[PDB]
Amino acid sequence: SVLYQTSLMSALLSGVYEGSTTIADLLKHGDFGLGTFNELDGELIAFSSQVYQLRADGSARNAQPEQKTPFAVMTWFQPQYRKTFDHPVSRQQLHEVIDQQIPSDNLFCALRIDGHFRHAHTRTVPRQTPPYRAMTDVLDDQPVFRFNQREGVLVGFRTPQHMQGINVAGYHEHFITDDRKGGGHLLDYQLDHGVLTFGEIHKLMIDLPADSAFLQANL
């Protein structure tokens, strides 16, 4: 298993909000992952090669193969572990299960949950036009959506602290509903019951783009 990363979080945060990488290009290096759309028009969630666009209004829709991303992380998901929960468990409790099984912070984890969420709180970036506001100011203004008692899918990664420059350090998780019409970037959640699958990943490929914005960015 290889975590295949398109560009750098530092480049995204510097104001490089467009890339030439398509959703079809992402699915060449995985069936599973997360990322951002061109102009920061929400974020993607991918699992079993199905890709959805999650937008700031709490909506999900099928991603089109031609859509472009300035940043993404994909893998061929090959989980080594399965745990079924018949009783409610919080996000932080689920992370403790994963951290106990993969206690080295120096490895990546990929995690998926299929089940019934008591709640799933989401906040997703809206489409930006330059000159760009500070990301923290954009997030202050974005409403949180609260999915209550919903069946759905969670996709996430755990990133080592030794990667903080390059990627989201810690857990990054996205959510989509069973009907695939709702979801977002997760702030917190509680699983009422469902199945966790996850695995460790030892290999990271970083693919730096050629666009002039990336090349001329100050990192």
Residue 44, strand partner residues: 35, 53
Residue with tokens 């079993």: 48
Contact code string over 96-135 relative to Cl ion, x by CB under 5 A: -----------------------x----------------
Which positions from 145 through 184 interact with Cl ion, judged by CB under 5 A? 146
Enumerate binding residues for a second copy (CB under 8 A): 2, 8, 10-11, 104-107, 160-166, 202-210, 214-217, 219
Q: What is the closest distance, in whole angstroms, from the C-beta atom of residue 18 to a second copy in the complex?
A: 15
For the chain, the first-to-last Cα distance in angstroms comes to 28
| Residue nearer to a second copy on the CB measure, 10 or 38 | 10
Q: What is the closest distance, in whole angstroms, from the C-beta atom of residue 162 to a second copy in the complex?
A: 4
| Residue nearer to a second copy on the CB measure, 98 or 191 | 98
Q: Where are the beta strands (DSSP E) in the chain?
A: 2-6, 21-22, 32-36, 43-47, 50-54, 60-62, 68-69, 71-75, 81-85, 89-90, 108-122, 145-159, 170-177, 183-201, 203-207
Q: Which does 146 bind (CB under 5 to 8 A by kind): a second copy, Zn ion, Cl ion, none?
A: Cl ion
| Tokens encoding 106 | 């120096």
Positions in the binding site for Cl ion (CB under 5 A): 119, 146
